[PDB]
Amino acid sequence: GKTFFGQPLGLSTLFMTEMWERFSYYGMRAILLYYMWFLISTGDLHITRATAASIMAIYASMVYLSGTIGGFVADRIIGARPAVFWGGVLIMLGHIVLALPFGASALFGSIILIIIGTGFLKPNVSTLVGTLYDEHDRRRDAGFSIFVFGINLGAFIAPLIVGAAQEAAGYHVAFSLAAIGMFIGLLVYYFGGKKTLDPHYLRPTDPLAPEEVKPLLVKVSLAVAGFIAIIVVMNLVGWNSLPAYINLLTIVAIAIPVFYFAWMISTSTEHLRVVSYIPLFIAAVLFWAIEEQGSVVLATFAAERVDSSWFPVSWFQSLNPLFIMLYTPFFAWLWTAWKKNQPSSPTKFAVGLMFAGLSFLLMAIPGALYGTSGKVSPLWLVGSWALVILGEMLISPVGLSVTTKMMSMWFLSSSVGSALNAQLVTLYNAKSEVAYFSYFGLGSVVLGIVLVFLSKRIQG
Ligand SMILES: CCCCCCC/C=C\CCCCCC(=O)OC[C@H](CO)O[C@@H](O)[C@H](O)COC(=O)CCCCC/C=C\CCCCCCC
Ligand SMILES: CCCCCCC/C=C/CCCCCC(=O)OC[C@@H](O)CO
Ligand SMILES: CCCCCCC/C=C\CCCCCC(=O)OC[C@@H](O)CO
Ligand SMILES: CCCCCCC/C=C\CCCCCC(=O)OC[C@@H](O)CO
Ligand SMILES: CCCCCCC/C=C\CCCCCC(=O)OC[C@@H](O)CO
Ligand SMILES: CCCCCCC/C=C\CCCCCC(=O)OC[C@@H](O)CO
Ligand SMILES: CCCCCCC/C=C\CCCCCC(=O)OC[C@@H](O)CO
Ligand SMILES: CCCCCCC/C=C\CCCCCC(=O)OC[C@@H](O)CO
Ligand SMILES: CCCCCCC/C=C\CCCCCC(=O)OC[C@@H](O)CO
Ligand SMILES: CCCCCCC/C=C\CCCCCC(=O)OC[C@@H](O)CO
Ligand SMILES: CCCCCCC/C=C\CCCCCC(=O)OC[C@@H](O)CO
Ligand SMILES: CCCCCCC/C=C\CCCCCC(=O)OC[C@@H](O)CO
Ligand SMILES: CCCCCCC/C=C\CCCCCC(=O)OC[C@@H](O)CO
Ligand SMILES: CCCCCCC/C=C\CCCCCC(=O)OC[C@@H](O)CO
Ligand SMILES: CCCCCCC/C=C\CCCCCC(=O)OC[C@@H](O)CO
Ligand SMILES: CCCCCCC/C=C\CCCCCC(=O)OC[C@@H](O)CO
Ligand SMILES: CCCCCCC/C=C\CCCCCC(=O)OC[C@@H](O)CO
Ligand SMILES: CCCCCCC/C=C\CCCCCC(=O)OC[C@@H](O)CO
Ligand SMILES: CCCCCCC/C=C\CCCCCC(=O)OC[C@@H](O)CO
């Protein structure tokens, strides 16, 4: 019968929904840093470029952190299908805000809308993909990989289209194209979903029992009052600059996994089978930090150290999803052409971190060889993204499987690694380039070597 690459036809609806949301997301992040540079250059935004780079990292950290709770809100309160829709509406409003004739005053409102909207949408679109298959259907893994291909496709064409529009018609038009991309996703999702999506998911599947409402409200109210209390204390003692608020979000983002690990210890049955995952969680954090610096540090390098006079420099951001799409069929082959081998997940995470470290070590070569005052070939960045995505092909598909032996924890390692970036990327500039690349690249390599050592002990 009529299928979508052998899958239920409803997959095409969710395929396009996420392809256009990712288009709106990565099209925005391909030019947002340069947009802040521009506002700084005109005197409208009064921050350093180091702070702007820090804003990009904590922005990503909050988006992934917001995705850790969006599944709960849909499953218990509003439903998975309304969560995707209203999440898409909030994302669209987030980009419209940047298309309005405002300046730096609109940056915070746009960031908040997209953080909340992406938290509602991203975890619950993947959830809706699963609802196309029951628990016995073997097509589940094939349908998700096709779904992932739509993710990378939108992430691939967005910097090309949006980056070109910025260079031709300016930032406001470019951001409006991101808003239009999400709008297209809303049209296809709304009318397409009504035809093929199970109406059971218009409502929460585990709605709150009557006695559960109050303790949740107490739990939410205590968290907001405490967070607001901290901001009050900060302004009393003088810690009220934008870097101080970024440091607050950094501490909050890192304190979540460490508190969820400190009292997770207190049953020797898996007392140490949970300590097992910690050398792997720290490995995932450091890999995601390197990977998410491509839109910050490597975006800075592309704009300042690469002779890219004949094409928009935001196009470099397409190399990340391009290498993902090129690598995946080879690794799908490898993970079943090598049935006999299938090396251990702790070794996969160890080697994956070493490739990420090799991507930065490679970036230290041109500055050490030619100096940092000139311009170098774009192929240096191509080789860097080739190496780091090779590290992703190891840790990303096996990643959720290690901790199970929830994607929120893998939303979480991305948030912590991106929160770590909010501190580190302020260290990057033309004078620190070689030392920044060489030492964070070397440190990432040796931490992949100690993990290979520890890998024998971890498997138990
Ligand atoms: C069948 C698939 C095999 C793919 C594996 C090979 C990787 C692909 C291409 C490697 C090309 C090597 C670099 C070429 C080179 O040396 O540049 C020559 C060029 C002359 O016009 O000159 C230079 O001007 C350049 O400025 C000099 O600087 C360098 O070349 C330093 C290069 C950085 C080191 C890279 C060396 C080896 C990378 C191999 C990676 C393989 C990993 C596969 C998992
Ligand atoms: C999607 C971004 C990847 C771009 C990769 C481009 C690969 C280019 C390799 C050759 C190095 C740049 C050559 C510069 C060049 O030829 O310019 C033409 C001439 O007008 C001098 O500017
Ligand atoms: C006005 C500014 C508000 C911005 C909203 C951003 C909200 C971001 C995050 C809030 C959720 C934090 C709690 C996340 C959490 O603890 O879940 C982790 C857990 O699921 C691990 O599996
Ligand atoms: C109108 C206010 C903004 C939109 C409301 C949604 C704001 C995001 C989160 C509010 C807290 C909801 C409860 C989240 C929660 O308890 O997460 C628990 C965590 O274990 C999830 O698995
Ligand atoms: C700025 C935009 C304001 C909001 C415009 C859209 C509101 C118009 C009608 C409400 C539609 C709500 C549909 C919620 C929903 O669950 O949709 C799921 C989708 O699969 C269709 O069932
Ligand atoms: C429980 C709450 C967890 C904390 C979530 C709060 C995250 C809220 C906002 C993060 C935005 C990052 C900073 C935005 C920013 O700096 O832009 C404004 C700046 O350009 C104005 O000069
Ligand atoms: C379909 C409903 C949501 C999608 C967004 C709809 C509005 C998008 C674009 C309308 C025009 C965008 C504004 C362009 C603009 O004003 O910037 C250009 C000009 O101000 C600078 O010279
Ligand atoms: C200044 C530019 C306009 C700013 C407001 C843009 C809002 C325009 C349209 C709202 C689109 C709602 C989502 C699109 C959609 O498919 O909704 C269908 C649903 O509402 C039908 O019941
Ligand atoms: C930051 C501001 C957030 C404002 C909205 C956050 C609300 C968080 C917790 C309160 C949830 C109460 C929802 C009650 C509900 O819908 O269920 C009622 C019913 O199912 C019980 O029988
Ligand atoms: C539950 C216990 C509450 C105790 C306080 C918890 C939060 C403690 C410290 C938060 C500090 C925010 C980040 C530090 C900071 O503001 O740095 C300031 C510095 O960069 C110059 O302003
Ligand atoms: C999440 C619970 C409600 C919290 C209400 C208070 C939220 C206030 C700040 C959240 C963090 C964003 C801080 C970014 C910021 O405001 O920078 C302003 C900048 O001008 C510093 O002077
Ligand atoms: C008993 C609980 C386990 C032991 C406590 C572990 C510490 C818990 C939370 C601290 C989060 C790490 C500090 C965040 C960080 O490294 O950045 C600091 C920087 O932003 C301040 O300028
Ligand atoms: C071939 C694939 C992996 C690529 C990484 C291989 C290169 C490994 C390390 C290169 C970094 C060399 C750093 C040299 C250096 O820092 O010198 C310092 C001085 O020359 C610059 O200030
Ligand atoms: C198989 C990987 C190919 C070789 C990778 C090893 C690359 C090691 C260093 C990068 C080239 C070194 C550039 C020369 C250098 O750093 O010296 C500069 C300094 O001595 C001048 O004062
Ligand atoms: C799996 C792929 C590993 C990548 C290997 C690392 C290769 C990285 C950089 C090679 C730099 C060669 C650039 C020389 C070049 O062709 O352009 C000449 C330049 O002067 C034009 O601007
Ligand atoms: C098990 C949880 C994983 C925790 C991974 C994060 C590691 C903990 C703290 C990292 C602190 C990074 C501090 C960066 C730093 O101080 O240098 C940058 C600073 O100059 C920014 O102004
Ligand atoms: C020599 C240390 C053990 C080697 C472990 C293998 C690590 C992979 C490639 C070698 C990386 C060499 C990095 C050289 C380096 O960091 O120099 C720092 C430079 O800034 C000082 O000249
Ligand atoms: C064990 C968990 C590792 C997570 C954190 C790893 C890095 C932690 C702190 C780094 C801050 C110290 C910065 C060292 C440094 O000088 O780098 C800057 C240099 O390369 C350029 O000047
Ligand atoms: C300056 C030298 C650069 C090249 C050295 C890098 C390779 C050297 C040693 C790597 C293997 C060290 C031993 C690791 C090992 O086999 O531990 C056993 C482990 O597999 C059991 O889980």
Numbering used by the authors: 5 to 270, 275 to 413, 423 to 477
Give verbatim excerpts from the published study on this entry.
Two examples of protein crystals embedded in LCP were studied: lysozyme as a model soluble protein and a peptide transporter (PepTSt) as a more challenging membrane protein. We have produced an end-to-end demonstration of a simple yet robust and efficient offline crystal-prelocation method based on 2D full-field phase-contrast X-ray imaging on flat double-sandwich samples, a well established format for serial crystallography.
Crystal-specific properties such as the size and diffraction quality of individual crystals also influence the indexing process and therefore the measured overall efficiency. This could explain why the PepTSt samples yielded generally lower indexing rates than lysozyme. We attribute this difference to the crystal-quality variation between chip 1 and chip 2, as only chip 1 was used for rotation data collection. Such sample-to-sample variation is common for membrane-protein microcrystals.
